[PDB]
Amino acid sequence: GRPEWIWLALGTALMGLGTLYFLVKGMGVSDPDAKKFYAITTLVPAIAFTMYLSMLLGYGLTMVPFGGEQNPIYWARYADWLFTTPLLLLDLALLVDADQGTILALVGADGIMIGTGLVGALTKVYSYRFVWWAISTAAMLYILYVLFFGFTSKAESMRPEVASTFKVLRNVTVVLWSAYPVVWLIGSEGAGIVPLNIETLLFMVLDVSAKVGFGLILLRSRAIF
C-alpha cells in the first residue's frame, strides 16, 4: 500500500541480521575494554531494528499538516537516532580515549541535533521547519569538528592501528552524517522534491552503512583490544 514499505522491510532485516552477527562475534570476548565496544555496537542495530519495524507496521508514522497538505513523517527515525547516534559517538570516544568533558559535550551536542530535528520534523509552520534544520545542522557541524580536528589530533598520539581505524571510521562518519540533512531538506520533511520511497531508500542505505557498516570496520580491527 505504501511503496516505501519494501525499503522499511529490507532495512528491518538488515538491522536484524546486523544485531545477530554482532551478537555472535561478541560471545566469548572477555577483555573488559572489548566488551565495551561489542555492547555499544550490538545495541545500535538492535535499537535501529525496533524502530525500522515500527515504521514497517505503521506505528512510527504520523501525518503533520504543513504547506496546506498532510505530510507523512516517519518520527520513529528520531527515536532511533536519539539513542543510536550518541552510542556511535561513544564508540569513537573510546577508541581515542577521550576526556569525559569532551564526551559530554558531544552527547549533549548530539541531543540538541536530534532534538531540534524532531521539533522541526513536527513543526506545522513550514518556514520554522528550516530554522530548526539550521540549528540542528549547527549542532552537527560542532560534532564533526570535534571528531575531525579534536579526535584526529588525539588519535595521532595513540597506537598506529587505533589511529588507522579511527581515520577510517571518522571519514565514514563525516560523509554519511553530512548526507542526512540533505535528504531531509529534499524529502518529505522539507520541500518534497524527492518521493518518499526514494527518501526511504536513501535513509536505509545511510542507516545501514553508518551502523552495520560502521560496526564491521570497528569490530574487525584489533584496536578494540
In whole angstroms, what is the distance from residue 213 CA to residue 93 CA? 18
Task: Give the position of cell 563525516.
Answer: 174
SS3 for 31?
A: coil
Experimental method: X-ray
SS3 for 74?
A: strand
69 φ, ψ to 5°?
Answer: -110, 180
In whole angstroms, what is the distance from residue 70 CA to residue 210 CA? 30
| Resolution for the entry shown, Å | 2.7
In whole angstroms, what is the distance from residue 108 CA to residue 170 CA? 19
Instruction: Locate 21 and state its grid cell.
Output: 552477527
Residues 6+ apart with CB under 8 A from 124: 64, 65, 66
Instruction: Locate 218 and state its grid cell.
Output: 570497528
28 φ, ψ to 5°?
Answer: 95, -25
Q: Are 73 and 120 in contact (CB under 8 A)?
A: no
In whole angstroms, what is the distance from residue 70 CA to residue 62 CA? 9
Which CATH number does 1-225 carry? Answer: 1.20.1070.10
Q: Are 221 and 41 in contact (CB under 8 A)?
A: no
User: What secondary structure letter does DSSP report for 221?
Assistant: S
Which secondary structure element, helix H or strand E, spans residue 78, and what is its range? helix 76-95
Residues paired with 73 in a beta bridge: 62
